[PDB]
Amino acid sequence: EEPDREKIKLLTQATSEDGTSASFQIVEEDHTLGNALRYVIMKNPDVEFCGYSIPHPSENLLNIRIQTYGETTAVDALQKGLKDLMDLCDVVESKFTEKIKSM
Amino acid sequence: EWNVEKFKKDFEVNISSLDAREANFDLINIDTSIANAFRRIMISEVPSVAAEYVYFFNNTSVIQDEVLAHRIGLVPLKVDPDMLTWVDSNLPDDEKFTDENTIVLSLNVKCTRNPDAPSTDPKELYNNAHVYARDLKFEPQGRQSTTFADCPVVPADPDILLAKLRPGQEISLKAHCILGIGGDHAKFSPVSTASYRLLPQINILQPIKGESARRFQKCFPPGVIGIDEGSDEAYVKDARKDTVSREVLRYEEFADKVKLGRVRNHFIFNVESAGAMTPEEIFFKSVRILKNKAEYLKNCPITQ
Amino acid sequence: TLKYICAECSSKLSLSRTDAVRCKDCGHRILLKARTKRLVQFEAR
Amino acid sequence: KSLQYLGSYIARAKKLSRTQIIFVASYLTSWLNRYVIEREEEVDQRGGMERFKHFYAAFQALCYIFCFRHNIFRDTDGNWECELDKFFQRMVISKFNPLKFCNENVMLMFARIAQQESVAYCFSIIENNNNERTRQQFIDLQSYFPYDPLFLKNYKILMKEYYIEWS
Amino acid sequence: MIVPVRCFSCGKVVGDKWESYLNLLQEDELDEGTALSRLGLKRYCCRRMILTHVDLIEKFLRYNPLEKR
């Protein structure tokens, strides 16, 4: 049994005890996913604040901060934005497969 | 209220052309922060096979050893990825390269004088005076004879001029070719130029019928503006053809009569290839890497 | 068999102890060291 | 660390008196019942759960006793000394949740033993940490058991009378 | 020195087009303009790398310390 505990690190110094406002810290990520994830998280009707931020160009880090209104924590809203980004990549893959099979 | 079923009902793909090296295709009604990520991955994250470690035995030619080892690394190999596996970084050298990670190439070229009639061209006058990229001889090491027999390792452009010699001089080397991503070094980049452009939008405002419509033809590429008469005056045939040169916005007859914007969710991707993979297939790798970039973040714990 | 090269007449030439450091065909003094078969390694970067 | 050393010295020592076992636990539950008024509405104030690390360390030592020395607190009738079958009923559903904030493994086996002794029923609240879940030097002191079994091959022969095995 | 393998800016493979380009200017007597477009160099970041190459290796190769004269 071996998970990976460096890839995502919730920063408790800026995380509300309510859970509805947290600041995550990914390693080895940048504008690639952090702008794709910020887009899909902001489509949740319960999200009040979302933004990604790279602290310095040197280290490969990524901070995204979700604040919700209520009845959904930011950890609960981080993972809805990861499934809908997983579901969106399957739509694009299912359309780009048809059109290659349409030539 | 945004939903992923709303995205599926209004997302189209219109493939313009699809060559063996370049593919051109449009994505419609997707966000700029998602279509940027596909360009982003095709350059960086999509892996490829490049020579990484170069072992010289004798290089007596004019080109330096660290330069010639760099030129071999920029040679694109026609190796399919998802045959090699990823080499490990923190295991020592005697255990690091296997018959499953590494492809071994080699090169043994000596130049000799040729007795020829006479100024004179060096392909007539010296034997092995030009080293090409096809002289990288694939050496199937380990069990790479029952699995690379259909597909032998050949450079994707076999006429890349690697070095030049004169008689007496020789090059004798052995390069290990390993898998890697383009974000580390640019030689692992599977695509020459993966890029998009945004669809131009030409909004004529007043009717610009007449001889003025003939000089509104000329302010665009020829397959953009069409004319019939004062009726069917000036309509946009194909805005995809237009490069945004803004030649119409420097005339005083048309500073008021047109507006030049973009269609903000209509992308026009142009994906070439380094030869190792077809460009429609390094796009599927790009869209699955982003999905696999997100499953690994979903199915992952959070401590402290 | 280690050798050298005469810089003038380009004749390959090994050299022993108690020898004048000269080429043996022309009488040239400057006599550059050839390279032999020996492994060096590089990153392809 | 001394609370960490206390629960492992009581429960991993063979030749003791049974009335020595209870007076540690009687004083320890007294300290938690002298905790019962003063510091049990401080939780809802602006602070953290790290303000109570002395309380969680003492309750963790209480769980480590009962996972080893449990049949002592069964009396002749079949009941429990000093309301231990009523004490953990209050401690678990308190506003500290000491099931989460103590060590995982000493609380994992305490949940199994509370079923096999019929003292607590705290499975569903350890279950109730799915989306619900400085600290590193506090997690690590919960992992240092002082009376881990000896590796020394020839000193344990003397210690076999003194030091209790797993079962 | 020798022709670069790739374009510096975009990254298209350029180093196989130097010996072809010198035939398109000697044999076919084309200009530099049509000789680049026939080779497929269509972005001006990679047109400027065949167009502009010096090919100093043929000047370095004349100094061979391994042969007579």
Who contacts A34 (Cβ-Cβ below 8 Å, separation ≥6)? A26, A52, A54, A62, A64
Both B133 and B165 in a single domain? Answer: yes
Domain spans of chain C?
Answer: 1-45
Q: Tokens 């000896």 correspond to what residue? A: D150
Contact B106, B174 (CB under 8 A): yes
Who contacts B43 (Cβ-Cβ below 8 Å, separation ≥6)? B182, B183, B189, B191, B194
Helix or strand (DSSP H, E) at C32: strand C31-32
Detail the DSSP E strand segments found in chain B: 12-18, 23-28, 47-59, 103-110, 112-113, 126-127, 130-132, 137-139, 161-164, 170-181, 194-204, 225-226, 235-236, 258-271
Any idea what the CATH number is for the domain that residue B32 is in? 3.30.1360.10
Q: Which residue of E has its CA nearest to C31?
A: E65
Total domains, chain A: 1
Mutate which: B48, B57, B166, vs C, most C CBs within 10 A: B57
Q: Tokens 């008196």 correspond to what residue? A: D17
**Chain C: nearest CA to E42, how far in angstroms?**
28
DSSP annotation of B239 reads G
Tally C-beta pairs within 8 A across B and E: 71
Total domains, chain B: 2
Contact B153, B53 (CB under 8 A): no
CA–centroid distance for D143 within its chain: 13
Instruction: Determine, for residues C44 and B50 on separate chains, whether the beta-carbon distance falls below 8 Å.
Output: yes
- Nearest CB among E65, E67, E68 relative to C32 is that of E65
Q: Tokens 């010996």 correspond to what residue? A: E19
Both B39 and B114 in a single domain? Answer: no
B94-122: b (≥16 Cβ within 10 Å) or e: eebbeeebbbbbebebebeeeeeeeeeee
Instruction: Determine, for residues C42 and B54 on separate chains, whether the beta-carbon distance falls below 8 Å.
Output: yes
SS3 B288: helix
Both B154 and B54 in a single domain? Answer: yes
CB-based contact, D48 to chain A, within 8 Å: yes
The string of DSSP codes covering chain D is -HHHHHHHHHHT-SS--HHHHHHHHHHHHHHHHSSTTTTSSSTTSSS-GGGGHHHHHHHHHHHHHHTTS-TTTB-SSS-BGGGHHHHHHHHHTSTT-HHHHS-HHHHHHHHHHHHHHTS--THHHHSS-TTT---HHHHGGGT--TTPPP--TTTHHHHTTTS----
Any idea what the CATH number is for the domain that residue A10 is in? 3.30.1360.10
Q: Which of E23, E38, E48, E6 is nearest to B161 (CA)?
A: E6
Alpha-carbon gap, residue E29 to E26, rounded angstroms = 5
| Chain B contact set for A4 (CB, 8 A) | 300
CA–centroid distance for B280 within its chain: 11
End-to-end CA gap in chain C: 34
Alpha-carbon gap, residue B288 to A97, rounded angstroms = 13
SS3 B197: strand
| Chain C contact set for B60 (CB, 8 A) | 35
Domains of chain E with bracketed CATH? 1-69 (1.10.10.60)
For B301, half-sphere exposure in the C-beta direction (CA atoms, 13 angstrom radius) is 11
The string of DSSP codes covering B145-196 is TSSSSSS---BSSTT-EEEE--TT-EEEEEEEEEEEETTT-GGG-S-S-EEE
Both B192 and B95 in a single domain? Answer: no
Instruction: Determine, for residues B73 and C45 on separate chains, whether the beta-carbon distance falls below 8 Å.
Output: yes
Alpha-carbon gap, residue B13 to B7, rounded angstroms = 13
Residues 124-183 of B with CB under 8 A from E: 130, 133, 156-161, 163-169
CB atoms within 10 A of CB A21: 17
Q: Which amino acid is at D116?
A: Q
Alpha-carbon gap, residue A85 to B49, rounded angstroms = 29
The angstrom resolution of this structure is 2.9
Q: Which amino acid is at E15?
A: G
- The token pair that represents B271 in the structure block: 């994906």
Rg (CA), chain B: 27
- The token pair that represents C38 in the structure block: 């020996």
Any idea what the CATH number is for the domain that residue B168 is in? 2.170.120.12
Which residue segment(s) compose the domain that B265 sits in? 1-47+187-304
DSSP annotation of B142 reads T
| Chain B contact set for C42 (CB, 8 A) | 53-56, 65-66, 69
CB atoms within 10 A of CB B265: 17
Chain breaks in chain D (C to N over 2.5 A) after: 133
| Length of chain B counted residue by residue | 304
| Chain E contact set for B39 (CB, 8 A) | none
CB atoms within 10 A of CB B269: 22
CA–centroid distance for D20 within its chain: 17
> What angle (nearest 5°) sits at the alpha carbon of residue A40, between those of residues A38 and A41?
65
Q: Which amino acid is at E23?
A: N
Helix axes B32-43, B281-298, angle to 10 degrees: 110
Query: Which of 2.20.28.30, 3.40.50.720, 3.30.565.10, 3.30.110.30 would CATH assign to domain C1-45?
Result: 2.20.28.30
Both B99 and B68 in a single domain? Answer: yes
DSSP annotation of B134 reads G
CA–centroid distance for B110 within its chain: 34
Q: Which residues pair with B23 in a beta bridge?
A: B18, B271
Helix or strand (DSSP H, E) at B6: helix B4-9
B218-252: b (≥16 Cβ within 10 Å) or e: ebbeeebbebeeeeebbebeebbebeeeeebeeee
Alpha-carbon gap, residue A22 to B5, rounded angstroms = 28
SS3 E49: helix
SS3 B18: strand
Longest CA span, chain D: 54
Q: Which of B196, B197, B199, B195 is nearest to B263 (CA)?
A: B199
Both B60 and B181 in a single domain? Answer: yes
Both B69 and B182 in a single domain? Answer: yes
- The token pair that represents D9 in the structure block: 């010295």
Q: Which of E5, C40, E60 is nearest to B59 (CA)?
A: C40
Q: Which amino acid is at D45?
A: Q
Which residue ranges of C are tagged as binding site for Zn(2+)? 6, 9, 23, 26
E7 is in an annotated binding site: yes
The string of DSSP codes covering chain A is ----SSSB---TTS--TTSSEEEEEEES--HHHHHHHHHHHTTSTTEEEEEEE-S-SSS-EEEEEEEE-SSS-HHHHHHHHHHHHHHHHHHHHHHHHHHHTT-
SS3 C33: coil
Rg (CA), chain C: 14
Who contacts C9 (Cβ-Cβ below 8 Å, separation ≥6)? C23, C25, C26, C28, E68
> What angle (nearest 5°) sits at the alpha carbon of residue D52, between those of residues D50 and D53?
70
Which residue segment(s) compose the domain that A12 sits in? 1-103
Determination technique used: cryo-EM
| Length of chain A counted residue by residue | 103
End-to-end CA gap in chain B: 34
Which residue ranges of C are tagged as binding site? 6, 9, 23, 26
Who contacts B295 (Cβ-Cβ below 8 Å, separation ≥6)? A82, A86
Integer CA distances (angstroms), E61 to B16, C6, E55, in order: 48, 19, 11
Q: Tokens 């990229």 correspond to what residue? A: B133
Q: Which amino acid is at A1?
A: E
